Amino acid sequence: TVQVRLELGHRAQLRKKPTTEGFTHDWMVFVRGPEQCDIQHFVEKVVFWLHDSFPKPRRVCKEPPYKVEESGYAGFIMPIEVHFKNKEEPRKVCFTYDLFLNLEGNPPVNHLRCEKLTFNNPTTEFRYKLLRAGGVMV
Amino acid sequence: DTSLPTSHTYLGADMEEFHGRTLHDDDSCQVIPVLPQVMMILIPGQTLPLQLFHPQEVSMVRNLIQKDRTFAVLAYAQFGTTAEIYAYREEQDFGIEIVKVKAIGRQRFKVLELRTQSDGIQQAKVQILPECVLPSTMSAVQLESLNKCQIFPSKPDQCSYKWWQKYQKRKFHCANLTSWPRWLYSLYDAETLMDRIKKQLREWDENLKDDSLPSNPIDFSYRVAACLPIDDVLRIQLLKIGSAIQRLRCELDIMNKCTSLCCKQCQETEITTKNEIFSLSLCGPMAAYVNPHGYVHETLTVYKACNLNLIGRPSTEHSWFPGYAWTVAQCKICASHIGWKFTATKKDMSPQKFWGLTRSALLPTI
Numbered sequence: 278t279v280q281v282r283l284e285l286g287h288r289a290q291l292r293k294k295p296t297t298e299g300f301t302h303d304w305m306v307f308v309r310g311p312e313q314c315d316i317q318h319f320v321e322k323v324v325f326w327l328h329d330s331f332p333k334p335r336r337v338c339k340e341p342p343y344k345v346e347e348s349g350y351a352g353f354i355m356p357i358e359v360h361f362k363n364k365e366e367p368r369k370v371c372f373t374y375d376l377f378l379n380l381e382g383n384p385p386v387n388h389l390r391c392e393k394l395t396f397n398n399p400t401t402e403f404r405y406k407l408l409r410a411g412g413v414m415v
Numbered sequence: 416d417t418s419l420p421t422s423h424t425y426l427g428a429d430m431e432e433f434h435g436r437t438l439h440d441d442d443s444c445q446v447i448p449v450l451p452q453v454m455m456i457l458i459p460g461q462t463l464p465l466q467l468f469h470p471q472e473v474s475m476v477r478n479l480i481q482k483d484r485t486f487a488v489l490a491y492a493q494f495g496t497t498a499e500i501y502a503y504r505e506e507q508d509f510g511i512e513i514v515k516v517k518a519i520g521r522q523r524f525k526v527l528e529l530r531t532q533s534d535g536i537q538q539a540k541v542q543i544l545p546e547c548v549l550p551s552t553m554s555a556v557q558l559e560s561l562n563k564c565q566i567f568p569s570k571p572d573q574c575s576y577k578w579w580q581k582y583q584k585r586k587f588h589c590a591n592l593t594s595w596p597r598w599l600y601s602l603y604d605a606e607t608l609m610d611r612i613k614k615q616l617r618e619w620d621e622n623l624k625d626d627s628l629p630s631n632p633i634d635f636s637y638r639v640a641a642c643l644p645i646d647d648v649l650r651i652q653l654l655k656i657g658s659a660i661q662r663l664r665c666e667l668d669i670m671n672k673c674t675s676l677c678c679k680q681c682q683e684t685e686i687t688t689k690n691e692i693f694s695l696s697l698c699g700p701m702a703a704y705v706n707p708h709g710y711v712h713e714t715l716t717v718y719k720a721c722n723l724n725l726i727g728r729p730s731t732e733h734s735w736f737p738g739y740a741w742t743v744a745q746c747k748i749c750a751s752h753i754g755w756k757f758t759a760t761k762k763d764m765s766p767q768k769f770w771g772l773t774r775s776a777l778l779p780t781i
């Protein structure tokens with residue numbers, strides 16, 4: 278069995294100069310995984326789902342860093358898909374990141390959520406790539 | 416003006432500066448921290464600006480400024496480049512202790528081991544690679560009686576066929592003592608290769624000053640490699656080469672061969688051609704800049720771009736080039752973020768427009 282950590286996060290800051298479109302905050306969501314691990318060893322790509330109000334609702338990042346820098350006026354629930362090079366399920370993992378912006382004139386919002394994921398039946402090359410990334414076999 | 420872009424004023428106005436130099440002797444084993452968010456292949460002499468926001472990277476950079484002001488950037492690894500911090504500033508941004516720094520690539524190295532740490536400061540066991548300096552190719556084939564005729568009166572027809580023919584005839588007169596002609600030895604001479612590379616650069620930039628380029632073959636070669644629109648594999652090959660002459664010859668070969676840059680996503684759409692490249696910065700046509708969120712892009716400046724489309728209205732909120740407003744630009748075929756178009760805020764400014772394309776989205780083609 279293989280047990281690997283992941284870390285999702287986002288930041289949001291009030292725009293000092295509101296734009297003509299009416300946007301008041303700048304927000305960035307990023308998937309980086311745990312501390313000091315090249316996720317690319319086992320993640321083929323990452324998919325970011327944005328509110329349809331944004332143009333190009335579906336963003337794709339095929340190499341790290343995996344991110345979506347954007348501007349807006351309101352938050353939402355943002356789906357994220359992390360697809361691995363796994364040869365069998367789990368081949369993809371879905372998260373529902375609560376993307377929220379800082380209102381109430383508080384200091385800018387910064388959020389980090391840590392999660393744990395499981396893979397089964399790892400092969401020798403699978404274990405090799407996980408150890409390249411630092412994954413731990415349990 | 417061409418000095419403004421290198422100032423990186425968009426980051427901030429005042430930042431503590433450290434003018435000291437930290438060097439590591441050759442073939443010496445070191446233990447160096449590794450920055451996790453830098454995948455760039457830092458070349459010696461290239462400026463790396465960063466805006467660290469991670470809770471632990473702030474602590475690591477604080478320890479670095481406390482001691483030795485140096486970290487590592489792996490050639491994402493078996494090779495990497497050390498970066499020496501030279502500008503520093505703290506701020507409270509995004510609700511976090513954010514640290515804005517500027518460093519310079521200093522030394523190449525080979526990776527021996529990568530060991531993690533409890534705090535997360537990945538320590539690399541580092542071997543400092545050397546700079547192989549060779550004497551003149553005529554050093555072994557020389558006549559003492561002619562040692563006087565090795566320093567030439569001046570370097571003023573002039574700066575053309577005359578001076579260079581005389582240079583070849585005088586400094587490589589002993590080729591006849593060997594089985595090889597003088598013009599062969601001319602191909603392994605630092606001065607001639609540097610002059611040819613300078614001719615190519617001047618072809619790129621008609622407003623190029625000789626004083627702007629280093630007179631040292633090593634520094635000149637590193638600057639040339641830093642300013643070429645090339646891929647990652649060639650960057651690694653250039654870093655691996657330890658002899659200045661070999662690097663200069665490789666750079667000349669690349670410059671001769673390279674013709675155009677295509678969309679790294681489409682792979683068949685051309686965006687720009689090497690003849691349209693131009694330098695708006697003393698650093699060179701290509702330089703590294705950070706976006707508002709702290710991530711780094713290598714931008715190359717051109718007069719014109721092909722198959723490009725713009726989004727938004729030019730703004731000067733965080734422009735990398737003062738006096739210019741940026742509009743996000745992308746390849747119209749696929750909309751991938753290729754770069755931006757910079758337009759003049761004033762009307763009496765030269766040029767009135769140009770483009771800056773991120774190297775991370777450009778694929779050179781031959």
Ligand SMILES: O=C1C[C@]2(CCN(S(=O)(=O)NC3CCN(CCNC(=O)c4cccc(-c5cn6cc(C(=O)NC7CCC7)ccc6n5)c4)CC3)C2)C(=O)N1
Nearest residue numbers: 328330331332346348349350351352353706733734735741
């Ligand atoms: O020259 C240089 C350059 C830089 C300075 C800048 N950089 S950068 O470009 O790299 N970084 C970033 C890259 C991203 N850029 C913006 C991207 N988006 C756009 O353009 C764009 C265009 C058209 C429409 C929209 C849009 C956003 N919407 C939000 C909402 C919303 O909130 N809905 C809520 C209701 C519940 C959810 C609704 C509709 C909507 N429509 C967005 C900003 C800059 C480097 C430098 O430092 N020097």
Ligand SMILES: [Zn+2]
Nearest residue numbers: 678681746749
């Ligand atoms: Zn494209």
